[PDB]
Design a protein around this ligand. Structure first.
Ligand SMILES: COc1ccc(S(=O)(=O)N2CCN(C)CC2)cc1NC(=O)c1[nH]c(C)c2c1CCCCC2=O
Length: 109
């Protein structure tokens, strides 16, 4: 049994983002070896993705809403830091982040 906010972050926020057309690059960790990105783990000290966030939500890892929001923010900023600002992945990230922020301000008290 989790707090109302955490429940909403899983059943509303994560689930809406997961079903989005641009969720696919964000549903699993970046496999930097398979994708030939030798400096990825050197630049990204804390990889994060929606698949990892989901499991944490489902496992009661998070103490409260803000910790989950922190993970989401890390996922987005990792993408902006690593890629070039015109890359497709970055415009997908921006799109997904605006919806996220949208659903976050809709969060219950
Ligand atoms: C060619 O890309 C892929 C090929 C296959 C796969 S995948 O997991 O094998 N899978 C996705 C789900 N689909 C159903 C099956 C294929 C992922 C990816 N890539 C990503 O995810 C991804 N995500 C980020 C955030 C970045 C990247 C790579 C871009 C630069 C680093 C970067 O920032």
């Amino acid at each position: 049994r989790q707090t109302n906010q955490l429940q909403y972050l899983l059943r509303v926020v994560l689930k809406t983002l997961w079903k989005h057309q641009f969720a696919w690059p964000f549903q699993q960790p970046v496999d930097a070896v398979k994708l030939n990105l030798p400096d990825y783990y050197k630049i990204i000290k804390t990889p994060m993705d929606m698949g990892t966030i989901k499991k944490r939500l489902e496992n009661n890892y998070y103490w409260n809403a803000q910790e989950c929001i922190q993970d989401f923010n890390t996922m987005f900023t990792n993408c902006y830091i690593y890629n070039k600002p015109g890359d497709d992945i970055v415009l997908m990230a921006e799109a997904l982040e605006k919806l996220f922020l949208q659903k976050i301000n809709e969060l219950p008290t």
